Chains A and B, each alone.
With several copies, the nearest count.
Chain A
Amino acid sequence: STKDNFNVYKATRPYLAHCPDCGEGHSCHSPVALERIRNEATDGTLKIQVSLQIGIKTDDSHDWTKLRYMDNHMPADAERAGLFVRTSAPCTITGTMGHFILARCPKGETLTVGFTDSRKISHSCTHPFHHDPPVIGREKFHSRPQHGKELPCSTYVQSTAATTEEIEVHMPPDTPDRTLMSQQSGNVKITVNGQTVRYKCNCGGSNEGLTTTDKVINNCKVDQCHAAVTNHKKWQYNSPLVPRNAELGDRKGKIHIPFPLANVTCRVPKARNPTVTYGKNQVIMLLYPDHPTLLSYRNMGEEPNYQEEWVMHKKEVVLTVPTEGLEVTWGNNEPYKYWPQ
């Protein structure tokens, strides 16, 4: 029994869609077209949606080392290792499943997603995207600590499971193909090749029809005709970069997606406690930050007079301690309280 073999990818397929920059600023019908970039995760993780499907082979089988993309009319297999994500510099890919990629990217103004096909030909899609993720906590750090202050943050979970979030899907539109038509001496010959072809000619007689068998259009030229293969057996993401199917109305399905956004915990480092010296209603701190650290302070009376500054390097701070008291917060550390003697 294979009663637990539910595979949504048997119904869906990778596709070709519009990309404004396929390299060198020129637009193309991309097999790695960018659909949507999600940046709701406060931890800085990007949830990227593309036209291809990662971790799935053409036979619908799941294989993490493989990737499937639309090659002209038919989907083809490609290596997962060849897949790359970049902004101003390369990104760290944290998870891949179907149309979705999880990536940790450096600061940038564009977002590029690419891969290398079977023929060793590189394909990429560039979209303008301002990426500069906000700071988690009060300290701008580079690497993730094992221990630190536990702060609330959101991330896209690395779980391959699809249970909460979803996308709209529908049948793809008719796929135009000029190779279906040929010039039989001085007429039009439409060869279906075991497919359902929708044809239309700028000639008399039986000029149109949804055919399953070969058709001939006598007293007609090849340029006067339009031929397209219909796709009623497959599903495709409801993409605004692909036209809607003309035959069916507002017909649509829905499928669950991997990596949903969830509330988690982010560990942040606590900046080293500064060298503190005292004076009459005055506190002097010698700040030695290892990275940008936020310093904030307020009076504990009627007039708090809240002040804040990002401390980048070695700086001596002179603060007035009123009779009511002074509260000082240095980065992710718990607030220090000062009172006059």
Chain B
Amino acid sequence: PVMCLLANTTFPCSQPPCTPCCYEKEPEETLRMLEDNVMRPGYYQLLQASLTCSPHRQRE
């Protein structure tokens, strides 16, 4: 299990709480969260999940 940081909490890097469309919802907050995990080994797992948008209001 690879862990990332958000304020006073730890969470799985591939699963940030902002999902889906982290950037579309809160662009400033998403980038701030990514900057806080730049040194973490699971940064690219967090970058992948945060910059992926598969919204609810979609068939596929």
A–B contact with Cβ pairs below 8 Å: the answer is: yes
- List chain A positions with a Cβ less than 8 A from chain B: 1-8, 10-11, 170-171, 232-235, 251-256
Question: Nearest CB to that of A248 among chain B residues?
Answer: B35
Q: Pick the 8 closest A-B CB pairs, nearest first.
A: A233-B27, A2-B54, A232-B28, A6-B52, A251-B35, A3-B54, A253-B34, A253-B35
Question: How many residues on B have C-beta within 8 angstroms of the other chain's C-beta atoms?
Answer: 20
Contacts of A170 in B (CB 8 A): 35
**In whole Å, how far is B56's beta carbon from the nearest beta carbon of chain A?**
11
With contact pairs A6-B48, A11-B23 given, residues A253 and B31 touching in the complex (Cβ less than 8 Å):
yes
Write out the residue numbers on chain A whose beta carbons fall within 8 Å of the beta carbon of B35.
170, 251-253
B47 adjacent to chain A (CB < 8 Å): yes
The reply to whether A11 and B52 form a contact with Cβ atoms under 8 Å apart is no
Name the residue on A nearest B48 (C-beta): A6
A253–B52 CB distance below 8 A: no
Q: A6-B52, A7-B51, A11-B51 are in contact. Are A254 and B43 (CB under 8 A)?
A: yes
Contacts A1-B54, A10-B24, A233-B28 known; 10 new A-B pairs at CB < 8 A: A5-B53, A5-B54, A6-B48, A7-B51, A7-B53, A8-B47, A11-B31, A251-B35, A253-B35, A255-B47
Residues on B facing A (Cβ under 8 Å): 23-24, 27-28, 30-32, 34-35, 38, 43-44, 47-48, 51-54, 58, 60
| B50, closest chain A residue (CB) | A11
Cβ-defined contact, B34 with A10, below 8 A: no
Decide: A2 and B23 in contact? CB cutoff 8 A.
no
Pick the contact of A8: B24, B43, B51, B54 (CB < 8 A).
B51
Contact A256 B44, beta carbon cutoff 8 Å: yes
B26 to A, closest residue via Cβ: A233
Known contacts A232-B28, A256-B44; A5 and B52 CB within 8 A of each other: yes
Q: What are 18 A-B interface contacts by the 8 Å CB criterion? A: A1-B54, A1-B58, A2-B53, A3-B52, A3-B54, A4-B52, A5-B52, A5-B53, A6-B52, A10-B24, A10-B51, A11-B23, A11-B31, A233-B31, A234-B31, A253-B31, A253-B34, A256-B44
- Contact A1 B43, beta carbon cutoff 8 Å: no
Most buried by B among A235, A254, A256: A254
The answer to whether A171 touches B51, judged by C-beta atoms less than 8 angstroms apart, is no
